[model samples]
Target: KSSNAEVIKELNKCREENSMRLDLSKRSIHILPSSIKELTQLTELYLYSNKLQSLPAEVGCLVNLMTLALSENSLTSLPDSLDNLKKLRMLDLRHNKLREIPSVVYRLDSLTTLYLRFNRITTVEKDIKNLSKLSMLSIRENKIKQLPAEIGELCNLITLDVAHNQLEHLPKEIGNCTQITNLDLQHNELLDLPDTIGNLSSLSRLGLRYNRLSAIPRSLAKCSALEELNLENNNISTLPESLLSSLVKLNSLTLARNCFQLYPVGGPSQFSTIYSLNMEHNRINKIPFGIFSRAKVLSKLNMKDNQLTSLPLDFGTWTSMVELNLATNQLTKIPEDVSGLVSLEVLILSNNLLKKLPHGLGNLRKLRELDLEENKLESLPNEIAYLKDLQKLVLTNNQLTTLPRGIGHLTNLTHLGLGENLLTHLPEEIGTLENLEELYLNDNPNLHSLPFELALCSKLSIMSIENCPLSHLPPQIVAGGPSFIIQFLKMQGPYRAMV
Candidate 1:
């Protein structure tokens, strides 16, 4: 869209060839072409998807510009000659329609990365704490509601994306930046967070996803080099067991879609080095038993869409769980000696109401990914094919209609879902799972195909058959190269298959 007479004739041929990198991006030019005040040996200048509504007080003659990208512009302000970029070091006004920003642009003390994300910036000008060689400061999706109490003078800031802002509060001098290490305040409108944000103690990733936080400040357990703590969709209904006894090297903790109905007073102890614990869509129903008695390095425990009906027989003390989410819990059965969780490799127990499945789950034996989606299982207990390191087997929306020829002795099966079950066929010894890889036969609307020796388990890689009446599909399991073929489907949400 190069107009404005070809960006002022390419800024007078890059100031008669003293060009130091200048890219007039998508120049549909709505302004800013006063011949860019004659380039002046520009050092990197890219006017992104421009409709520039301003910026040409001779843009302070570049003055040896050192990187400036007027991000998708319709600029609402910022031409204090941008403090004449005294050798600016990165300044991308992202999706700009800026609503305010002139503290001489944070006194650009050689700014180092300052992208004002989708702006309408509502504040931040305490001279932006004098940038101080700012190291990454993305004011994410803004409508910024506060934060300039000398924002701890940036202090060598290290990544701070104020995610989808409208921030309801935060200026406790941002724990004095203290070399921050990633801090995204996701979808904000925060309902309380300050406890001096644990003085950031060099935080290592802490995103407060979707907020309205109901509690969390035991000074965030003093960050202690926190390693990933994404409090997903909050309303946090309680969890401060002194903030999990001060996360000792936490490794990943995302309280998913929260409202956490109790059950949060510490879990995975033993100097917990949490490895992954989501707590998916919470409203948690109960889990106490000292919750994983000392999470011996928890390995992954999502608790899919909680409302859990049971579990806490010291639930195998999470023995370094390899993956154990109690999918949509209301469980009608499962604990008849869960084989003391022989290093269960994955057992989600999908959407529960189970009609039966425990036979000591054939002594786990390093079982792998076993979901059991939407249960009320009508059948499927040939000791569940003695999980020989069974690999990924979902059993979608179940009420099963047939599938127990000892499921062809699981032979390290690889991914097999069986969507919305009422399955009409497939037990011709389900052709020994030759390492079957992903085969979710969708909504069995009276299944109608696939049994030609089920195409000899040729490592099928993805083949769903939606709402199915499958007209055909066994030319070697769709030529045995099937890489995703879902046919018919039906869903009612909130059954997030996991395990």
Candidate 2:
């Protein structure tokens, strides 16, 4: 039915029926049928993604409803009769215009999940404590300035996300929600957290990023089950050893954009069990030797935009590292021991002062992506050819005059970047990279011609050959597409053979 009244007329015909669910989402409905109240046997009703500006008071007749989804509507307020839905266990009013949470919701003792995200609600009253049975409450991306202290009364709460709000502080009673497992308070102005936050014994994930916190309470160490913690972009310079030692199950930790001058030292053994660690964009200038030597299981480590000039020789002890990023640093050379990371898949060392890579790099046959842009390299070791599985290689803005013929041995290579270099010519062996898809060879003033053998790369889709000195090149071939260039190369091959 295209009209609201038409849908209602049909719905009313089923009044004496016992349908258990009704879904009317994305129907361009501007008003709900008053006959909806006759669906007393309905346990679930979905009216989301409509133009509904208001719900009828007769909706209260759905006393047996257990779930109601009215999200993505224009509703400015909920009907007072909504209190009749006493048996409703889940209610989703997200992406609506409701300015305040209806008082009737606070009285629903059976409600377990309530999502009021992306709304204009500016305040949460202490009456919110009335929903003691709620296990999940998401009011994120709102204008809430402070949470009611009674919010801690929801003892059954397992997930609470109030992120992206104007909250300046959390009530101390928040620790009373002992069963909380996930708590997100990011993008707020919180100056600090209540020390009682340590009381969340079941806590597993906590996000307190983008706050003004200068220090974390040592009591947080009591969260023994904590696995993921994000405190990035904070004022804290250091973490207490007691706290670090207590997170035995911690797997991912992000503390980027902090004020630390040195990588924390006393807990390398504890951190050995962690898999991902990010501390980029900090003031860390030195890392103690063997600081991460015991992190045998660590796979991803990002320390970009730091003052690190060199890594400890024992850095290669992270044998499990799969991705390592150390860009935008003062490093003049990568520790030769780094070649020990045979399992590495992505290695980024761009914007450094490196002049050479260790020949041992060829040992990492599993490497798939290698980025070494904006470096001081004069030549690449032939060992690079050993990366037969390499897919993407970026070496732009270097001082290389030519690539080793061994590069042609990387048959699996796809995208190759060698722009802004001093190369006078590419090795004829380059044409052997039949899998090459995109090649960047621009801005090499000393270059005169490309090897006609490049036409052999059947998969070559895009090639940049501008800003280079070339001879005997037809204007059509120079300005045409990859197909045109390939055809020109094929025709020129016969002439060269005859000569």
Candidate 3:
């Protein structure tokens, strides 16, 4: 009743005393109460958060309105008497300032869910082809740019969020919306993308992240129920092994910041159901051992900024790998047949030039997150404490000065990035890492002290110790104050999941 002329005179006295359903909310009422066009048997109308700006062409005498919530309004348009609410079906003009929308909602054919997100909608004209039983359309972060080929008559649309719109092109009759199944054209400006999009045979997630795609149209391998394909930051150079055997039910394929140099690996059935394959900023120098002998159900493999120097001695036959990214590659060693990858568990040899490390990697007893960052390591192979399930051990900017007293047998270590290396001392069994939390030791400008048994690692949190001249810091990481480091940074891995 927050006065819209007392809620249109009490909805015209509940439509001449009988026909019900009328709810005028908050109502700092700015418009919308022309006796509400004499409530013709109102059927549910809640005008919420109002400062409303329009909607009174005598509201077409509400021929039984069905459901209309003018959410947070300042509505700019919408009033061909709102097509006499032909039994409307859900239409909430969300946080409105709507730019336009009154072509009587394309003759509302029993409308169905249309929220008009945020709003400043830039375009979508063809009266949205009469919302053919519209299913779900959110128009996310709008400023939309072109989209009116009658939206392929919204053939029972399933879910579509035109993410951060400004869309450049996309109307090849949109494959006639064959039951669209989640199609979000992320941050649009779409360069090219219309081979009728493989006729969307029941599409299942396809977001073209950031845009300017340079390639990827093997007619999208006919979208065999695509499962998650975000071509992150594009300029894609090459990747059509018949579009990866038609994404064999892809699980997650994001070609990060593309320029993809090459990795077609002879398209073995397009990576037989890839399970997460993000080829980071490409210029890949090598990888063809038929790409891991036909990628045996790869489990995450991100080839970070490539120019790789070696690794294809049948690279451990991918034995269902867990994670392995050869960061900033050009490796100088470590390929002792990767000990036949006995179910590897995360090994990113960061910024390479590695001096060594393949004593069969201590037979890889399921190692865990071992990024040897910015390498050139001076030493480290006491069979690396046989990695008893090591937790997170990133060797930041290498050239270590010492640290292999079997690194205190790793004892399920918990995050220990030896920052910008050149250490001076530390191996007093680094206090057996009783689940150490974060302990970076800052840029070791000739680090000095640190192992008075390091407080026996009573679950230490963070102990960065900045540009270390080390005055002292180990009181169990200053009494566990900060460590929330979940630094896995395992660049790329997991390649199978479209199916």
Candidate 4:
């Protein structure tokens, strides 16, 4: 040890005599002085992110401490005298090397919150019941295989997160905490849930993704207050009728990467309250007319990477549609009936067999992004200029011969993807896109030249002209990037040049 005086110097710097708080976090101290007991007036001590392997037993003398944060430390054990802090309400030992809950922690009867995340603890001790006032306990990202049934004694618990562990089952007594609203147990080996889970009527958010669940417990129908349910990446193939119609307040539902063949919507009652639904990477090939019955309030819908080939354009109930993604499907056409999507903002139809777009596609007044890459389009409708709010127009790897002149009216366009196509020339009106930042016009052997008017795009910073038949531009100017090429084009001085 260098000097006892150095330790006291740091202690004095962090001591708050009047505020009753001490902040020694990140102080690089491996050992705290037993003399710390002299500061009995301290109510809060933060020693987070330190290298200390243990705390001095004299720390127990700070009986007035209300919160003690020891997160991000290397401590593997605790001083038994720590139980003397009778007034502690919050104790954090997150991101530590502890193999089990410290025996002294159960004696902190006044504790209301305890976080032991990212540790090696394999089980919760029955002594957990000692903290009757605990309201939140998060032991996530640990090796916990079981939770003590005595945990139900914390009647005041409002949140309990034990996700990212080896939990195979939950203690049936867990339902005793009727006040818990958020329970996270995702990324585990849970095969199913106990019927008692329905007793948690106050639960609002339950996360069970990345589990081995094959069927949902029907008792879940009692959790009517649930607002969010995420069961993505599981073996679930069906939804119980009772569980579907019970969650009347659910607004977000994710069932992607599952064994679902038919849509999980339980008729109008289920879609009536859902605003966001994602069923990507499923085996669904058809969506019956039932979905269009009452799904008008839905603003977001995703069904990408599915076996969907075609769908009837039913706009009678699609009033609030904002985002719809149907990419990576066998779709051959988007019917002209889609013009009725009044509130559409983002539309993704990439990687399909689309040969031509209906001119009616331009009727979406609020459309912002139009992703149609990897299709077979020969020409775009001239009415595309009607999309005044368009920000990104992706049309890569298509079969286009020329771009319509009206594209120049897309003044708000930030990106224009025209790479890997057969285009010979772009419209001179392309210069009107003053906000264009990225231009992907590479790999077109027939593209011999570009209009010098393109220099008008003040924000045109990223461009690709490689593998093109550009006749007059020098290689050095092209090598210097878009800025130099823009400068060369502007040198022509207000007179537009085309070769």
Best by lDDT: 2
Off by over 4 Å in 4: 1-19, 292-296, 471-489, 492-499
Error of 4 at 443 (Å): 1.6
lDDT of 1 at 333: 85
Worst 10 residues of 3 by lDDT: 484-493
Candidate 2 lDDT at 353 equals 96
Off by over 4 Å in 3: 1-81, 84-128, 131-151, 154-182, 185-196, 199-205, 208-218, 221-228, 231-240, 244-286, 289-310, 313-499
- Cα RMSD, each candidate: 16.1, 2.2, 17.0, 2.9
What's the C-alpha lDDT at position 363 in model 1? 76
- Summarize candidate 3's per-residue lDDT along 1-499 as a digit string, tens digits: 3665676677777777866677777858777656666676777878878787777777667777778788788887786767767779888886788775556776887887888877887877887877789888878777988787788888888887888888877888988888888888888888888888888878879898997878777777887888888888988878666676666677678887888666764545666667778887778777766654565577888888777788877787777888888888788997778878878889888888997687888778898888888888888888888888989989888888889888788889899998888998888788777788788878898875665555567677577856666435444443443341111101111211210
* TM-scores for all predictions: 0.35, 0.95, 0.34, 0.92
Order of the predicted models by lDDT, top scorer first: 2, 4, 1, 3
Best-to-worst ranking by TM-score? 2, 4, 1, 3
lDDT of 1 by residue, 50-154 (tens): 788777778777888888889997888776776877989988988978887755687778988989888788887777767777889898988888877787877
lDDT of 2 by residue, 1-499 (tens): 2497767764665565667887788888888877787788888888899998998888788898899999999988878898888899999999999788877778888899999999998989889888999999999988999998999899999999999998888999999999999999999988888999999989999999999988888889989899999999989898876476688888899989989898765757658678899999998997677667667689999999989988887777778899999999989987667778888999999999999998888888889999999999999989998998899999999999989999999999999999999988889898789799999988888877778888777788888877776555676666774566667876677434422
Please identify model 2 stretches exceeding 4 Å from their true place. 472-485, 494-499
The clash count for each model shown is: 10, 0, 22, 0
